[PDB]
Structures are given as structure tokens and as C-alpha cells.
Amino acid sequence: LQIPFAMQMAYRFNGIGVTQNVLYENQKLIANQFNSAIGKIQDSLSSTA
């Protein structure tokens, strides 16, 4: 069942015990943090063997 990804992340925030408004008001920051974390995963894999 399709759902907008921001809405899914709000569902997951509810799952961990945080209200949806936190995600909907910090969406830009959360997306930037996730993207930076994925980039750091890239760097860690491409450097550490």
C-alpha cells in the first residue's frame, strides 16, 4: 500500500514514541541527517577494509 515517505517516517516516529509534528517540522533536518549518514557509510566502506 503506497504512502508518502514523509508520512511513513511520521508513522515510524509514532512507533518510537515521538509525535508526528516533530518529523513534519524537522523534515529538512532529518533528511539531511539521513543523507549525511548514508554518505558516511559510503566513506567507511570505501576506506576501512
Ligand X SMILES: *[C@@H]1O[C@H](CO)[C@@H](O[C@@H]2O[C@H](CO)[C@@H](O[C@@H]3O[C@H](CO)[C@@H](O)[C@H](O)[C@@H]3O)[C@H](O)[C@H]2NC(C)=O)[C@H](O)[C@H]1NC(C)=O
Helix or strand (DSSP H, E) at 24: helix 20-25
Q: Which does 7 bind (CB under 5 to 8 A by kind): ligand X, other proteins, none?
A: other proteins
What is the smallest separation between the CB atom of 10 and ligand X, expressed in angstroms?
A: 18
Instruction: Name the one residue in this structure whose C-alpha cell is 515510524.
Output: 12
Q: How far is the CB of 39 from other proteins (least distance, A)?
A: 23
Out of 4, 15, 46, 49, the residue judged to bind other proteins by CB under 8 A: 4
19 by DSSP, 3-state: which?
Answer: coil
Rounded least distance, CB 5 to ligand X, Å: 18
CB 13 within 8 A of CB 22: yes
